[PDB]
Amino acid sequence: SRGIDTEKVLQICPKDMRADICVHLNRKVFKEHPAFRLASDGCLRALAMEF
C-alpha cells in the first residue's frame, strides 16, 4: 500500500468522482456476475459506494 490511504484519497475527491472511482474499483464483480446485468445507473452507483 505504500504511504497512501484509500479512504482519504476517496474523501478528497468530489461526489461524482467518488462514485465513478468506486464503480471502476468494483467493475470486476459488476461486469462479471450475471445478477448485476440488469442494473440501472443509480442503483449501480449506490451499490458501488458501499462495496
Next chain:
Amino acid sequence: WKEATLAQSCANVRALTYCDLHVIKRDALQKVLEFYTAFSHSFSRNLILTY
C-alpha cells in the same frame, strides 16, 4: 432480503491462496434493494448462492 433475520454461521471459512473479497453489509444492501423495487424483482430471481 428474504430471511429478514440473523443466523449463526454453521461452518468455518479459511483462505487458501492470496484472495480478494468484495463484502457488503446487510443493512446497506437491504436499503438499496428496497429503494429499487424493480431492480430487486430481478436480483432475487437471478442471484443464487454457491453455499
Next chain:
Amino acid sequence: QTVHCAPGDLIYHAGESVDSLCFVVSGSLEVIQDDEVVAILGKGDVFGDVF
C-alpha cells in the same frame, strides 16, 4: 452549503434519489432527458422537488 461544479461534471444522474433543493447563483446548467435538452437553467433559479 456552497458547491463549486466544474464544466462537464454531473450533479444528478438519472435514477439517483433527489433530496436537495439547490439554488443556482452563477453560471448556467442544463437538464438532459433521454439524451435531449428539455430545459435550461440560469442565474436565480432553483430545481428539485417540493419536499
Next chain:
Amino acid sequence: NLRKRIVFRKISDVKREEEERMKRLPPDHPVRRLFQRFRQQKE
C-alpha cells in the same frame, strides 16, 4: 421539477413511423394476454 418528467416524440421517429406505415394475430395469445393485463392495470 425533477420528479415529474415530460413526454414527447421525436421528428425522426414520427417520420420513420410514417414511412413504415406507408409500406403496410389469431395465434398471438401471449401479446393478447399482455394487452388485457395492460388494460386491467390502466383501469
Next chain:
Amino acid sequence: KIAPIRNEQDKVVLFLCTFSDITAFKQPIEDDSCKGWGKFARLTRALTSSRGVLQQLAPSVQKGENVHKHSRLAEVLQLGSDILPQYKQEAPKTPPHIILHY
C-alpha cells in the same frame, strides 16, 4: 478416470474424477430422435475437445483409434504432478540450479 490424492499427514482426503467424451468415436446408440443422421450430428457436435488439436490428425490418417485413447489418457495421467502438493501448505520451491538472493 478416477485418481484420489493423498495428504501430507499420510491420508486420503480428496478424490478426483476426470471426464472425457468419445460419443462420436464409438457405437452409435439413440433413444428418440427425429432422424438417425440428425442424432449422429448432435452426438458429434459435443466432441469438440476431442476433435480439436488433441486428435486433429485423425482425418489425415486411418485406424487412429489405437492411438486416440493413448493421446486422451496422456493428459489425464499427468494429474499425479498436481497431486504432489497433496492438499497441503506447499512452499514455493525454487527451480533447479537457482540460488535465492536472500
Next chain:
Amino acid sequence: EEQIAEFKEAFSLFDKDGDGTITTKELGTVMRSLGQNPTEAELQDMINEVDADGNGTIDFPEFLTMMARKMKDTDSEEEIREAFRVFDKDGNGYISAAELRHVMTNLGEKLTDEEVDEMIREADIDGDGQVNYEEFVQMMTA
C-alpha cells in the same frame, strides 16, 4: 434463434474439405478415422437424403433443418421467441417505442402516448429506453 449461430464452428470443423460443402474424400477420411466401415451406397443415400439439393454437396440449411427439428425447445421459450420475432419488425431483437406504436396501431388496440410510455417503463428496468429479453420475460412471468 440466436443460439444456432454457434454451429458455424462445428460445421467448419466437420467440413475439412474447405470447398463450402462436405466432400466425398472428407467423408471417407472421417469414417476411416472413426473406424466404422459402412456401405458406400449406404453413405451415398444418407448424404442424398440429408442434402436438400442431393447433388453430393451438403449445405448449411441441410444441417440447420435437422437441428431445428431435433432441438425440441420449451413451449414457453418458443412462444416468447415468436412474440419477439413478430414484435420486432427489423428483426434485431430490440423493441422500441416506435415499434410498440406500430404494432399497437396494426392490431387496432391504440393507446395514448402517456399509456404507451407507462407500458414501456413498466418493462424497462435500467431506465434508459430499451426493452430487453430478460425484462419482457420478467414482465410476463407475473
